[PDB]
Every structure is written in structure tokens, then in C-alpha cells.
Amino acid sequence: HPDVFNILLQVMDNGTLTDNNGRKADFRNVVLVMTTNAGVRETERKSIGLIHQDNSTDAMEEIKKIFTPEFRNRLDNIIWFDHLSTDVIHQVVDKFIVELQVQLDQKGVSLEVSQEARNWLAEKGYDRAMGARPMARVIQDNLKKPLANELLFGSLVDGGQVTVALDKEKNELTYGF
């Protein structure tokens, strides 16, 4: 609600907040972070007409008129985030794969993944509208399920190693021992 911003005013300006017992909270060693997507839809489309306008001064800059200027006046900075590039997507897929390898080594099942399999996973779950959020579901559905079958049914127990590669002929993955 816009009225919690009124508390946030004094929280950010004086670093102190009082509860109903009169005790004051000290915010001087507390980091205040607020996440949002305010100006996203305001700039996600081009102009209507024969001549395209700039439509760039609204770069989520119009987050004003939504945040009561006495509130924006006490923010340290409004840090805009950009959409992940394809390289960033690749790096995120690698991050998820390292996380999966750690979770698998926790059970003693070392995982080996081909770079082409990594790139297929990246191009598969690549999205700019949702960023790296659908990547987790893509990687889960593509890797965790058959591995979970192997680990739970008993065919793959402590000490196994798993490889995966792209089936370029039918756009699928490889699975083995």
C-alpha cells in the first residue's frame, strides 16, 4: 500500500522506528533494499504512428509520480537492471549446472555435462521476458527427472558418473550410466 511508504520515509531519513511500546529500532547498521519492476511495462513497447518517437526518456525514469518525490529524495540511487544477454544466460546455466553437480556429489554421483549440452540447455530456456526464472524449470525438467529415476530406483547408487550430450539429429539429450 502507498501508506507503508510513509513509514519508510522516516526509516530511511532518520534510521529509527518506534513500536507501540515506545522502544526505538536502530537502522543505522541495516541495509535497506527494495525490489520492483515499475517502469518495465511503460517502456516495453514502441510508439504508435508513422514516425517512431524516442520513447527512451521513459527508461523506468517514470518511476516518479509513483514514489512521492519526498521518498525518492532520500533514496541512495535507483539502480535499473537490464535484460540478461546470451552470454549472461550461458553463465547462469553454468551456475545452475555447478549447483547440480554439488548436489549430486553430496550423494557421491559425480556429473559430467558436455559444453554442447550446456548450450542446448541455454538456448532452450533462454528468455528475456522472464530472465533466468524459467531456466530453473527448464534445467529441472531436462536433467533432474531422469537422474532422479536413476538415483531412486537403485540403478544409479553412490559412485556413479553421469554424462550428457546433445542429440543434434532430433534435438534431444544423451543419458547413460
Partner: protein, 192 residues
């Protein structure tokens, strides 16, 4: 009232548009009745909005028109040729040389006409009253307009300019198969 309202659910399940706005939301534009300045301006506004909304998705223009002013039609035609997405024209009912011009002006390979539609083409009409000099001026202007229309039709249909010039001397009525063979449309919509 005279126009119905519809209900569709995306997030809250509360969306009531007139059926024309609901179809416009699906990138379907209706060109019906006579072609004049205000109707053509509305069609141009709809096409501009649809192009700005999604420049990659096609626009479907349903044509049922007994003709109209050449000028307003040329405005719709220029807006069709200018915007990025392919505009596909479907001729239901009739198209009398201006509905017909805009029908042949659709994106190549995407100009359809229903099996019982009727298409007519003819040279433009006009006139003027006044002194001989103004008569000559307006006659030269209408001749230039006729020549430009013949050039554009010969470009869009593939027929030679002389063939179009000989065919549009009088009213030429073309059914759906004759329109397909002539080059005005690309195919006939029959069933799903």
C-alpha cells in the same frame, strides 16, 4: 445496445468490449460500407495501433465495400504499404474497385476471397463544373489519378499495364475463381 458486448478472461476474468473491439484485439479489422474520409481515418488508426502493438503479427482486413472516394482509399493503401507487419485482405461480400483495389493491395500470398464474393474493377469517376481552364486542370488531374491507379493495379496483380487499361475501361465483374485466376487474390477460403 445495437452492438453486442462480449466477455473474455485473462487475469481477473472481467473484460467487456464491443464485439468489434474484441475482434480488433485479435488483429482483425473490418472495412465495410462506403469508403470515405472518416471511415478510412479510423481504419488507418486501427492499423497503426496494431502495427505499434506487435510489428511481427499479421493484420486481417475484412473487405465488404461498394467502393468509395479514391483519396481515402489511397490513404488506407499507403498505410497498408508503409507499416511493417503483413496485412492480409479477405474479401467477403463484394469489392467494387476500391474494396477491390485494397483487396489486391494486400500482402502477396495472403490475399484471400470467399467462394461467393463478387469483385468489380473500373476506371475512377469524377467531374467538375466551371471555366474551361479549370475543367482542363481537373481532367488532367483525374487522368493522372487513373493512370496511377492502373500502374498500381498492374503492379499488385502481375498483369501487364495495357491489360489492366483495357480491362478497367468498363465495369469488369469477377467471381472468386476468376479473381484468383486474374491475380487479384491468391486463393479461396473454403473450410477450416
Amino acid at each position: 445496445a445495437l452492438v453486442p458486448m462480449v466477455i473474455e478472461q485473462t487475469s481477473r476474468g472481467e473484460r467487456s468490449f464491443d464485439i468489434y473491439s474484441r475482434l480488433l484485439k485479435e488483429r482483425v479489422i473490418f472495412l465495410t460500407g462506403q469508403v470515405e474520409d472518416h471511415m478510412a481515418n479510423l481504419i488507418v488508426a486501427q492499423m497503426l495501433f496494431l502495427e505499434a502493438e506487435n510489428p511481427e503479427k499479421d493484420i486481417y482486413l475484412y473487405i465488404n465495400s461498394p467502393g468509395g472516394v479514391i483519396t481515402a482509399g489511397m490513404s488506407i493503401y499507403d498505410t497498408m504499404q508503409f507499416i511493417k507487419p503483413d496485412v492480409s485482405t479477405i474479401c467477403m461480400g463484394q469489392a467494387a474497385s476500391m474494396g477491390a483495389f485494397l483487396l489486391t493491395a494486400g500482402a502477396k500470398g495472403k490475399r484471400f476471397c470467399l467462394p461467393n464474393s463478387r469483385v468489380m474493377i473500373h476506371q475512377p469517376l469524377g467531374g467538375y463544373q466551371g471555366q474551361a481552364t479549370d475543367i482542363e486542370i481537373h481532367a488532367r488531374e483525374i487522368l493522372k489519378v487513373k493512370g496511377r491507379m492502373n500502374e498500381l493495379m498492374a503492379l499488385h496483380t502481375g498483369q501487364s499495364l495495357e491489360q489492366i487499361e483495357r480491362d478497367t475501361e468498363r465495369d469488369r465483374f469477377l467471381s472468386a475463381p476468376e479473381a484468383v485466376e486474374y491475380g487479384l487474390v491468391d486463393s479461396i477460403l473454403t473450410h477450416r
